[PDB]
Amino acid sequence: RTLIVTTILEEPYVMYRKSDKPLYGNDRFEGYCLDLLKELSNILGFLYDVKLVPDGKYGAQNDKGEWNGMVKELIDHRADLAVAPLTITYVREKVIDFSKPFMTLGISILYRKGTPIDSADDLAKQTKIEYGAVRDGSTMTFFKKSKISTYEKMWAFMSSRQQSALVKNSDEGIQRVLTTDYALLMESTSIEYVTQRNCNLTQIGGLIDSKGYGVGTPIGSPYRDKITIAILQLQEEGKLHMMKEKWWRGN
Amino acid sequence: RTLIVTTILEEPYVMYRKSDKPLYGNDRFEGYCLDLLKELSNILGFLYDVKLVPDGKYGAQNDKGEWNGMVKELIDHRADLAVAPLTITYVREKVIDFSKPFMTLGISILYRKGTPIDSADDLAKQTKIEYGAVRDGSTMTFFKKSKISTYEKMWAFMSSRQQSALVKNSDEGIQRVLTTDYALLMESTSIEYVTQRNCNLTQIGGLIDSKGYGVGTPIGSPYRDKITIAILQLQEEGKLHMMKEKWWRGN
Ligand SMILES: Cc1cn(C[C@H](N)C(=O)O)c(=O)n(Cc2cc(-c3ccccc3)sc2C(=O)O)c1=O
Ligand SMILES: Cc1cn(C[C@H](N)C(=O)O)c(=O)n(Cc2cc(-c3ccccc3)sc2C(=O)O)c1=O
Ligand SMILES: [Cl-]
Known part of the structure; x- marks a missing residue:
């Protein structure tokens, strides 16, 4: 066979x-x-x-x-x-x-190097730095379904700012990270892949799910x-x- | 039943x-x-x-x-x-x-906060900061069996300094971290448990295995x-x- x-x-x-x-x-x-x-x-x-x-x-x-x-x-x-x-x-x-x-x-955070931002909790409580996910992806869905208060707050920020916070695809999200004051919630595997190729970019915090x-x-x-x-x-x-x-x- | x-x-x-x-x-x-x-x-x-x-x-x-x-x-x-x-x-x-x-x-590193040390590669190339594992544990065995050059070098340092680098148990290793210029290679689960309870301690780098x-x-x-x-x-x-x-x- x-x-x-x-x-x-x-x-x-x-x-x-x-x-x-x-x-x-x-x-x-x-x-x-x-x-x-x-x-x-x-x-x-x-x-x-x-x-x-x-x-x-x-x-x-x-x-x-x-x-x-x-x-x-x-x-x-x-x-x-x-x-x-x-x-x-x-x-x-x-x-x-x-x-x-x-x-x-697991879901993690893609952001710039040399910033006091160290976790998802650091992002959630502020509004100066925008954060989001790929529209209708597994990461967005996690935040939509989450009953964890700190991710419920993050989803509320993503859903209300729906037009700008949620991006079309991974490529657009990475571009938004490199150009604006923005963090992309994405899978750790993809973050590792991007950070190896862009030295201005880094993973922030650990894994949000598994x-x-x-x-x-x-x-x-x-x-x-x-x-x-x-x-x-x-x-x-x-x-x-x-x-x-x-x-x-x-x- | x-x-x-x-x-x-x-x-x-x-x-x-x-x-x-x-x-x-x-x-x-x-x-x-x-x-x-x-x-x-x-x-x-x-x-x-x-x-x-x-x-x-x-x-x-x-x-x-x-x-x-x-x-x-x-x-x-x-x-x-x-x-x-x-x-x-x-x-x-x-x-x-x-x-x-x-x-x-996965195996990771337990060390003090506020140090330029950020990975296993940072430890391997130097000798000023001692590092090791629990004697005859799964973590020690990983380093002994490893064919990855950077962990081969780490094992060579642990094996030659056998008497001091390798500790009796997890409790002794943590005590050695808190008292001397030392890093303990240990499972991420246990590091998370210890760092939650000791605010002077932190995880260094990511996971070494899985x-x-x-x-x-x-x-x-x-x-x-x-x-x-x-x-x-x-x-x-x-x-x-x-x-x-x-x-x-x-x-
Ligand atoms: C490699 C990979 C695969 N998959 C599919 C998933 N693993 C499955 O089994 O369905 C997956 O969901 N992601 C994460 C992911 C991909 C996304 C995407 C959607 C449209 C166009 C381009 C990208 S969004 C996303 C996410 O993490 O939310 C991946 O990175
Ligand atoms: C909770 C836990 C369990 N085990 C057993 C292992 N998971 C198994 O399935 O055999 C395990 O090996 N470790 C890691 C570990 C424990 C160790 C120990 C040995 C003697 C006395 C006290 C501690 S050493 C060690 C390690 O990571 O090398 C654990 O932290
Ligand atoms: Cl199975």
């Missing part, structure tokens, strides 16, 4: 190689997730075929209970694995299985626990560290 | 209540893990009976492949669950199953995936955050 692996274009996890060389199949791609998949394939001993998810979506449900994205590919048995920056969530665990996480992350990226499988897949095992071995032997360092490290 | 839950005395996860009131069974105990277990019991709908692991050990193997501690309790079917600060590891996954993690942690605490079950237990589900719901509804804040927050 050659395993079909669903994934999604997303820097630095999955990219097309910058090459016009004759590269076919899996060799057309590079990135953290491709390196992970190679290691998994060598530990478990499987052949695989990487296929980009046709609709370019991660996976969400409609009101009929119909799914899209990589999740739908797994549900339909059109992929054996999803290897992507795919969050392990309660709702998704109802319909697919996941390995234990190969990467753990979640993991895991390898998705159909419910009952005999590969799920094997992949957990492989992930733990890669973690303990320092290989996850070196794969992260390969793709995240800047100049 | 009343589930037998193996656990271990460990502040703030599992403690005896400071009370001479007539408290029996589960009511004799308090702590993060007791709160977690209560929530798990209410989501899944199980009765349970907390039993402290007789040998007071987490779980390790000898050369005959014989296990001890909470791991051995699970292997022997003398406990249905282990709910404790029990690390999900490759070797343990060979003999027991684990839920996905309810807490994620691991999770999970609920242990015997291999094949039908509770493992259910507990993962419950953990994700507690995470997403902010309950893991508030349980952490209950036990970790200082004065």
